[PDB]
């Protein structure tokens, strides 16, 4: 359920590397058999997308800087 700090860092690094909200490519890097590591092996594409939106919402709602990697996550950030 809840994410570790390492998982959150991997999602942000993945977004930076795949140059956009390309969730399957993040799992090529960090998912099961990931090229970099398996730190996101238990998060599916639906989970990556929702977490990226929730992290962007967290920075916005707390008045903190949105990292460049999350600026490509656009549109509605509300939970389904």
Curated annotation (Swiss-Prot):
Entry's localization field: Nucleus
Disulfide bonds: none
Consequence of gene loss (knockout): Cells arrest in interphase and have an aberrant chromatin structure.
HTH myb-type domain: residues covered: 2-52
DNA-binding residue intervals: 23-48
Residues annotated as transmembrane: none
Function summary: Binds the telomeric double-stranded TTACAGG repeat and regulates telomere length.
UniProt subunit comment: Homodimer.
UniProt name for this protein: Telomeric DNA-binding factor trf1
Gene that this polypeptide is encoded by: trf1
């Amino acid at each position: 359920g809840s994410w570790t700090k390492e998982e959150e860092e991997a999602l942000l690094d993945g977004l930076d590397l795949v140059k956009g909200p390309r969730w399957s490519q993040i799992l090529e890097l960090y998912g099961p058999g990931g090229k970099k590591s398996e730190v996101l092996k238990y998060r599916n594409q639906v989970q990556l997308k929702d977490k990226a939106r929730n992290m962007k919402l967290f920075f916005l709602k707390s008045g903190q800087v949105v990292p460049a990697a999350l600026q490509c996550v656009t549109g509605d950030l509300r939970r389904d």
